[PDB]
Structure formats: C-alpha cells, structure tokens
Write an enzyme that holds these catalytic residues in place. Structure first.
Site, PDB file in Angstrom:
ATOM      1  N   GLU A 236      43.957  45.632  49.477  1.00 56.17           N
ATOM      2  CA  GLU A 236      44.747  46.165  48.794  1.00 56.17           C
ATOM      3  C   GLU A 236      44.614  47.136  49.409  1.00 56.17           C
ATOM      4  OE1 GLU A 236      43.722  44.874  44.378  1.00 56.17           O
ATOM      5  OE2 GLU A 236      45.246  46.219  44.896  1.00 56.17           O
ATOM      6  N   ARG A 375      35.483  42.013  46.256  1.00 51.68           N
ATOM      7  CA  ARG A 375      34.614  41.218  46.386  1.00 51.68           C
ATOM      8  C   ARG A 375      34.867  40.659  47.555  1.00 51.68           C
ATOM      9  NH1 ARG A 375      38.775  37.460  42.979  1.00 51.68           N
ATOM     10  NH2 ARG A 375      39.496  39.861  41.426  1.00 51.68           N
ATOM     11  N   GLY A 389      31.970  43.147  41.024  1.00 48.24           N
ATOM     12  CA  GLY A 389      31.612  44.401  39.505  1.00 48.24           C
ATOM     13  C   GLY A 389      33.035  44.038  38.717  1.00 48.24           C
ATOM     14  N   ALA A 390      33.115  44.663  37.404  1.00 48.70           N
ATOM     15  CA  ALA A 390      34.645  44.704  36.503  1.00 48.70           C
ATOM     16  C   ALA A 390      33.885  46.330  36.329  1.00 48.70           C
ATOM     17  CB  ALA A 390      33.493  43.930  35.723  1.00 48.70           C
ATOM     18  N   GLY A 391      34.968  46.464  35.593  1.00 52.29           N
ATOM     19  CA  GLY A 391      35.057  48.428  35.526  1.00 52.29           C
ATOM     20  C   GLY A 391      34.612  48.093  33.604  1.00 52.29           C
TER      21      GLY A 391
END
Length: 419
Positions: A236, A375, A389-391
């Site tokens: 993005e 990703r 990942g993740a936050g």
C-alpha cells in the site's frame, strides 16, 4: 503498443512475461501492479546496493565499492540521482532497517545488512486490460514477447500447501514478552512477525499467478532482484513525493494488511496517534507550515480507515530524506515507535529486510512512490519462506494472535506452486 490476446488475463500475461524475458537471458526484474496496470522493469543497466557498511554501485560488470556516512537517505538519494542522470525510471526496495538510523540503532546491525536495492531497468513493459505498451525493448526482448504471444500462457499447475500449525520461532512466547512490556509501560504497541519456511522450492511467477487470482489486492509485486526472489499482495502507498514538491503520506497504510464507538475505539485511538506522529515526522522535512492533514479518519474493495497528510518538500531536503523521515511505518513497528523498532530488534527474527520495508519507484522528474509491504513470500538461496505479523497490544493473547497470523498466511499458503 499491442492489443491484449482476448480472454487472457493481464496478471497472467504480465507474470508470464517476467518468466520468458528471464529464462531468455538471466535477467533480474521487478513486476509491479498498480491500481490496474502491471509494470515489468526488465533488465539491469545499473544497480545501487546500499548496505549497513558500504555503498556498492554495479554497472556493466564492474562494481564500485565505497564508504558512506550519516543519514542513509542522503547517501542513497545521491546514488539514485546519479543513476537517473541519463534514464527516466528506477525500481527497487528499501529494507525495514533503512529507518533504523533515525532512532540511533545502526550499531545493532550485522556487518553486511541490506538497506536498499535500486536499479534502472533495460525495459519497461506496461500490461493492462486493453493493451501491452513497450518502452525501450530491444530485439532480444521483443522476440521473447512475440514467442509468448505465439504460444499462450502456461496453465497453472496444482498448488502445494504449507502447514502453518507449528512454530518454532516461538511466536507465542515472544508475544507474551511483548504483552508484559506493554503491561510494564515500556510502550503501547509492537508488531511481531513470524516466518513459516517452505520445504519445496517455489516457482515464483507461477506462484504469483495463482495467488493473484485468489487474493485480489491494491498493489502486487513479483521480483528477482539481489540474489532474492519475492512476491506480495500486501503493498500500500505510504509515501509519495510528487514532481512539484508535494509529499503525500498515508499514516495508516498497512492496517489493511494488519487487519458504537465503544468497540473500535482502540482503532480510533491508534489512528489518531499514528496520524499525529507522522505529521510530526513530515514537518521535520517540509517547508515550515506546509504540512496539513487533508483527509482525516475517513472510511476508504476492502474498508480500512484512512487519513492523508500533505506537505511541501524544500529547498534543502531530498525525496529519500522524506522516505527516511517517515520510515519505518508506524503500523508495521509500533507505538511509541522508537520503542517499537527497538522492541522488534529484541523480540523478532532480524534483519526484517523487505518484510516491513518496501517497493519504491523513482522518476528523473523527481518523483517517488514507496509502498509498505508486509505478508510476502521470499527466496534467498535455498530457503523459501513466508512472513506475516500482527499488532500486539495490552489485551493481546499468544493463541488468538497466533491464529491471527495463520489467517494472514493463507492468502499465500494454499497457492504455493512448486518448481
């Protein structure tokens, strides 16, 4: 400018062009999809390789190796400018670690750490619904094209599937460490990631094809660049410098990949904070008083919440300095942010390079397009892998967080097309 074969898919054709024009020579390339067109940056004329310890510039065989000093943005920007002295466009990528000098952690970096890779191509090949337009394609390249057009695209073969059930990088443990530091007040958010290794090798353009039909992104890429293949559906726009001096940044870029105002109030909190810190950052780089938030917390097909920030550059700053000033992305490191970056060095497999960096296109007119990327699939030598990942926040849980990354991984996992 040629017509499209009719009932032949732009992405498929574009990915098949990358394969043919590569098996032809042994050429590096960067396939890049953007709002509806693909660009294939075909050859290598020159390459800028900015590492932690050196600048290398590689031309017609010979490398030119050199030391460089402060702010990687200036060292890169100069090299990029010399690259575009006599060509219109450059392409490459910039690593997470590119934003690491800002918070004074360059020391924590191993002796040969990739910072950026930028190259001018020998050919641009634009591929769209209605046409294929060719820029600077010599005989060698057009024969390849005519050859792919003679035959057609290959059928996509069966896909193979990875088992993202297990660790053993101990994402589980690491999240629980992050939750503990958040509880101690060390910081409020960090993004931890997780690698899944892929036993069999990927055929990239063919894995890219399959995954592109099953995902539907905003931007997509496929490359073979350093000694590295990569492929993604996560990119993005975060930061853009227009030809006229205006910088745009997109502070919540990556929440889309990262996934009653009483419930989604965490999201609103993080939206505000991340908006504010990027306005802080961009100002350190802009004409005094030119920085504004022009679109704010609006619902911008998927629906991630959005804000746009606008500024004017200078007299005195570079487009690459803009990039740095905004690197790395709030949404891919954490908040406070310095604290996130430093947390990542302690709690994540490092270096990240490319995972949470990204794509970057440049113009001789002075423009810059940089797109955060999360990703993706990667190959370097013999290991092929996925990274997602993740936050992690106060209320996060190892288990939920892990299954979170499982879901993020299977936008790639069932589409793995073996060599």
């Amino acid at each position: 400018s040629i017509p499209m074969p009719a009932g032949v898919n732009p992405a498929d054709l574009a990915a098949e062009l990358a394969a043919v024009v590569t098996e032809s020579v042994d050429e590096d390339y960067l396939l890049y999809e953007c709002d509806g067109q693909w660009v294939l940056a075909a050859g290598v004329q020159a390459m800028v390789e900015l590492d932690s310890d050196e600048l290398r510039v590689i031309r017609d065989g010979v490398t030119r190796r050199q030391q460089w000093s402060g702010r990687p943005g200036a060292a890169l920007g100069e090299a990029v400018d010399r690259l575009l002295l006599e060509t219109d466009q450059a392409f490459g990528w910039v690593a997470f670690e590119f934003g690491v000098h800002r918070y004074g952690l360059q020391q924590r970096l191993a002796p040969h750490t990739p910072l950026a890779r930028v190259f001018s191509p020998r050919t641009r090949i634009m591929v769209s619904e209605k046409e294929i337009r060719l820029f600077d394609a010599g005989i060698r390249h057009r024969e390849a094209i005519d050859r792919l057009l003679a035959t057609g695209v290959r059928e996509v073969p069966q896909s193979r599937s990875v088992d993202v059930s297990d660790d053993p990088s101990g994402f589980r443990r690491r999240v629980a460490v992050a939750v503990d530091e958040i509880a101690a007040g060390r910081y409020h958010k960090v993004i931890l990631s997780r690698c899944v290794e892929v036993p069999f090798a990927i055929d990239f353009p063919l894995t890219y094809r399959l995954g592109r039909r099953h995902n539907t992104p905003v931007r997509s890429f496929l490359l073979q660049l350093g000694g590295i293949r990569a492929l993604g559906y996560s990119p993005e726009l975060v930061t853009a410098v227009r030809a006229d001096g205006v910088v745009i940044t997109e502070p919540l870029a990556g929440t889309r990949a990262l996934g009653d105002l009483e419930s989604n109030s965490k999201e609103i909190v993080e939206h505000a904070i991340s908006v504010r810190s990027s306005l802080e950052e961009i100002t350190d780089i802009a004409e005094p008083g030119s920085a504004a938030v022009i679109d704010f917390m609006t619902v911008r097909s998927v629906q991630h919440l959005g804000s746009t920030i606008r500024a004017r550059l200078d007299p005195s700053s570079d487009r690459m300095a803009a990039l740095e000033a905004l690197f790395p992305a709030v949404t891919a490191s954490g908040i406070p942010k310095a604290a996130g970056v430093e947390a990542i060095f302690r709690l994540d497999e490092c270096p990240r390079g490319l995972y949470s960096g990204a794509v970057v296109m440049l113009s001789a007119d002075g423009g810059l397009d940089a797109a955060l990327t999360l990703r993706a699939a990667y190959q370097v030598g013999g290991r092929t892998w996925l990274r997602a990942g993740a936050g992690i926040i106060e209320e996060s849980e190892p288990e939920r967080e892990f299954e979170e990354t499982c879901e993020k991984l299977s936008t790639l996992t069932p589409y793995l097309v073996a060599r």
